[PDB]
């Protein structure tokens, strides 16, 4: 996997993507404007970063987001397309950087970088069943 | 709204709110482990700082996120409180920034900082109808 190599992955956003879906249980966003959620925004990255990554990691691995730093600029009602793009900034061993950025077909919506860390699954699923209370 | 006062919010992490549940239309999430994903954290995150803001906004006016840069260091399993602690830094017109910061009972989870903008929600909805498909 090379920096400087760049991954692209396109979403119609569904109505069940905005703010008051992301937090059903949250009566204070349950009359925000029906436009694409930032956690959805940045769920989005994270998959296309999983996308891109896949095809480079050994049998029973995975990974973890460790960082997402971006804005969101413009606003995506339901209907448009966003499409990310994710560019490979750098890679430290386990940690992979990511330069992230989106755009609805009509506005850049938010750019930034996401950070990950390789992971193997079923380690991780082990001291994560601990901590589990 | 007065600088540097600190906003508690609580949330006890359900079942419902790992990657895979962040994005169900995403195959390449099928296996990834139970713990509470960066988008639904970015999401409380926000979330807190909204109940921060809301009596301090006028009759007709909402926000939204513009950016959000965090790390995300430690992992959830559901059952666990997340606290979220946002910190107001500054109000600059209709610009409120944020230090915000999680903790989900045993460990630091992430921090760094949110930006929101004030909105009159009318005036909103109307420049989003006019990208709506």
Redesign the interface.
Known sequence: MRVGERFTHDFVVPPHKTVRH??PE?P??A?????F????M???M??AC??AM?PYLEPGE?S??????????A??????TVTVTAELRSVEGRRLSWRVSAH?G??EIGS?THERAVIH?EK??AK??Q???
């Open positions: 992301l937090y949250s204070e966003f009359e925000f404007p029906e436009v959620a930032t956690g959805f940045v769920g989005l994270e998959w999983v996308r896949a995975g973890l987001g460790t960082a997402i730093c971006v804005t969101h600029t606003a995506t009602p339901p209907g448009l609805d009509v506005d930034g699954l991780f699923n994560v069943r901590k589990t209370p």
